[PDB]
Structure formats: structure tokens, C-alpha cells
Swiss-Prot record:
Gene3D superfamilies: Alpha-D-Glucose-1,6-Bisphosphate, subunit A, domain 3, Alpha-D-phosphohexomutase, C-terminal domain. Monomer. Changing residue 321 to A: No phosphoglucomutase activity using G1P as substrate, protein is less easily phosphorylated, no significant change in structure. It comes from Pseudomonas aeruginosa (strain ATCC 15692 / DSM 22644 / CIP 104116 / JCM 14847 / LMG 12228 / 1C / PRS 101 / PAO1). It is an enzyme of class 5 (isomerase). This is Phosphomannomutase/phosphoglucomutase. Changing residue 100 to A/V: About 5% activity, still subject to substrate inhibition and requires G1,6P as an activator; phosphorylation occurs at a different site. Residues 5-134 are annotated as: Topological domain 1. Transmembrane segments: none annotated. The gene is algC. Its cofactor is Mg(2+).
Amino acid sequence: LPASIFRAYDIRGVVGDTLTAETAYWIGRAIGSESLARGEPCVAVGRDGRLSGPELVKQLIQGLVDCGCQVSDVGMVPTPVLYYAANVLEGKSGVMLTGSHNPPDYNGFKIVVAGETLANEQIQALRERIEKNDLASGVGSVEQVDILPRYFKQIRDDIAMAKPMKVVVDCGNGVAGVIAPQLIEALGCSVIPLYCEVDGNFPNHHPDPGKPENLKDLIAKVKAENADLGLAFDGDGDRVGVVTNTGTIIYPDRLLMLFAKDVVSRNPGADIIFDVKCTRRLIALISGYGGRPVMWKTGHSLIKKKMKETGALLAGEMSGHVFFKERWFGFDDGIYSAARLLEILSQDQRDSEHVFSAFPSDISTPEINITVTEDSKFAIIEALQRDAQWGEGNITTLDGVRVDYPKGWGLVRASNTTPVLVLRFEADTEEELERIKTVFRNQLKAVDSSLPVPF
Ligand SMILES: O=P(O)(O)OC[C@H]1O[C@H](O)[C@@H](O)[C@@H](O)[C@@H]1O
Ligand SMILES: [Zn+2]
């Protein structure tokens, strides 16, 4: 098996190339062996709506059963529905076969063993088990479980909308269309569907709400139908993107402000996690409401671990993964998050544009990406962490280097999904944004004067 598919947060490859049916079998065998080693024979399995789903899921399931595992096959479901299954069924282990927001031929595995989402050395440990033949052998079993209705009811029974809303829902032809439009209607909304037929060819736009290009159809429909809100889901339903009644894109760090207010109001002193890419305004906002702001590393699996370590009631990433523990289970779930957003907005007499515009705003950049190499990206960060001078500011090195200045901040870190450096800048003036950019530009050039600086 190729080493490149074993990534920091999960497993991901290209079907036909780096991820075959046989690889899926052996990955199943490794996960089943690790689950058993943690005392957990029961493993839930789900898949998204990708073309390669049926082929690879059978092999994944067989690998697990060949360890002696008891598999609960939940069929085709959103990622969070698989996480849900691993919280409410007998077993605390689960595997989701998904390639997330990537092009059609990509697939992969997001893995929970005995309650914990695997990352880093734990993901490599699976690859290492296969190489070593450190694998369990036994005769397992498979039971079909129809879990979607239970999930649907769980959310419906706990969300209380105070008024009706009209909402455009763009599924991007991903697996969210199996439930999101139906659930949102059941909450007391009317839903205008966009690309909600599940189709793994992704013939309209990629289900990647983090790019504004993939929200253009949603924004136009919101305006044309005079809708109260627009929602877009990524391919496997663990990410959500939001647009207001006037078409304004609400970035996830700003969504989190609304959610942090909600959660902290019922839970004084609650820990609230956000990643290094999120606005500093969120930090002040959480503290002002009496919560404890906890900045952490990018990556769904890393955020979920940090939530267990801190007891945080809510987490969010700039990528749109939002993780409710309060009233919920602590996993990232775009569908549940949409429902929580609708609950809050429905209790407000103002429109969604005005609810979000009331929070402070700064001037910010879109995520910047510089392509380096897979085998040099971490070394560039290490050199910055060793050598760099940032001027006066609060320096955080938990993920790359983030520096928080009086009037703004900057970040440079290595991506764990691509061979790139990722940067973000925010400040309260254009002048300050340029000052911080110049600091980072000069520090990168000090490490490697040939490095591109396309900001
Ligand atoms: O910045 P990175 O490391 O490339 O990851 C960015 C995003 O990738 C995926 O969408 C997920 O794993 C998210 O959890 C993460 O926020
Ligand atoms: Zn996703």
C-alpha cells in the first residue's frame, strides 16, 4: 500500500491509482485489529454517495469481519450520521468511507476507534500493522442498521424554531440530499432544493462550500426567491456554508460567534475551541460572554481530540466544520449545525443579514496558498519557529506560526491535505494588513529567498 494515502487527519487516495479494492480490504483489517486491541469488537460502517462507494465498502466490511468484528452496516449516509451511529449503537468504533469535498474519483476513510478519532501516528500505525502482519483473525458478522430515521428524530425532537423560515439548500449532489432538505422542512421551514439529487459525478459544481464560486448558484437563488437564508453542504455533510437573505457569505469563524453566544449563555465558563485560521474577534467575543477561548490546530480529528481533552462544549474551524457537544455528541456535523443556526435565527425578529452584521468585522484575506513540496513544508515551518523575528506581538506556534498584534494578526502553517503553506491575515485597516503581510513576506524570504510570496 502507498504511504501517501495515510494522512494526518484521515486516509485519502484516488481510486484506480493510490486506492484500490485490495487496499480497502487491508485497511479494514488494520482498523478491526486496532479496535479489538482497544477492547471494541463492534464497528459501524458508512459510505457517502461516491461512485466508488459500493466497491470499496464491501472490502472495508470484509476486512473488519475477517478480524472477528461485529459490523453494523448503515449503508449510504452523511459522515456525521456515521459518527452518530458510533455514539448510539453498541460499539464506539466507526469507519466512514468518504473522499469528502474532493473530485469524483477520490475516496478514503475517516476513522473512530473506541470513541477516539484517529490522527497522525495512529493513522500511520494502521499502515504499519499491515506491513508487519500485526492483524487479528476471526469470523465476524454484519448486521444492517437503518440509522437515518433515528438521527432525524433525535435532531427534530430537540430543535425548537419559533417562526417559519424559507431556506435554499444546496447539496452539491453530495450525500446531504438524503436528509438535509427533509429535516429542515420538518423543523418548520420551506426548502428550495439546489442539486440535492445524490450523484457522485458531481455534474454541477463540486460540493465544496469553502470556495465562493461554489456558492454563486445559492446566492442567486436566495435573491430570486426572497429566501431568509441559504445553506450549502460539502460532499459528505460535515461542513456547512451560510449566506444571508441579501447574499452575504458568512464565514465559519463569524458563524461561530453566533453559536458561542448561544452555548455560553446556558453554560457559564464553557470552553470554546477554534482553529488558528479564525478571527481574533472570536477570541474577545467568547471571553466577553464569560467563556474560555481555546485556540487549536486545524484538522477535524485534532479538534475532536482537543474537545475531549478540554471538555469544550463547542468547536469550529475556518473550513466550516462545526462541532457541538452541548445538546449533542461533539462531532462535526453540518446538518445539525444548520439546524442549530435555524433555531437561533428563528427566535430573532431581524433578518439573517442584520443578525450577523451586528458583530464586529475586520478586513481579512481569503486563505492564501503557496505550493512548496511535501517533504519540505514542515521544515519551512520549523525554520520559521527557530529563526524568525515577528516584532512585538503574541506568538503562537501550536500550528505553524501565528502572531497576534494590537490591530491584527497573521498566520503561516503547513497544510496536512496538500503540499502547501497556508496563510491568513486580518487587520482593522488596510495599512495594518499591509504591515503584517510585509512582516510575513520578509520572514519567509529570510528562510528561503526563492520562496514565492503571492500576497
Ligand atoms: O489546512 P489543511 O490542513 O489543508 O486542512 C483544512 C481542512 O481540510 C479538510 O477539509 C478537513 O480535514 C478540515 O478539518 C480542515 O479544516
Ligand atoms: Zn466534509
